Amino acid sequence: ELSNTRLFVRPFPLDVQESELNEIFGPFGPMKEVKILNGFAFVEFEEAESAAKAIEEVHGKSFANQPLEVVYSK
């Protein structure tokens, strides 16, 4: 059901941009691509490992005075 390289993030505030995604998901691996839309976010790593990790790393983090959430984007 899950993917090899794709992590779905929660909806970010007015600061919803790739800038934060890179500064956050940066220390994980070579992000093949990134997507930021008002309501939901997505990040595709160039390495399954980097993604599988970021999913268990970013998930449960904090940002914008709110609990972050990331999972394996279908």
UniProtKB/Swiss-Prot annotation:
PTM field: Methylated by HMT1. The methylation is required for nuclear export.
Disulfide bonds: none
Residues the record lists as Phosphoserine modifications: S62
Subcellular location: Cytoplasm; Nucleus; Cytoplasm, Stress granule
Transmembrane segments annotated in the record for this chain: none
Start and end residues of each RRM domain: 5-74
Quaternary structure note: Interacts with RRP6.
More details: Present with 78700 molecules/cell in log phase SD medium.
Family the entry assigns: Belongs to the RRM GAR family.
Biological role: Involved in mRNA processing and export. Required for efficient splicing of a large set of pre-mRNAs by efficient co-transcriptional recruitment of the splicing machinery. Remains associated with the mRNP during early steps of translation elongation.
Protein name (record): Serine/arginine (SR)-type shuttling mRNA binding protein NPL3
Species classification: Eukaryota, Fungi, Dikarya, Ascomycota, Saccharomycotina
Gene: NPL3
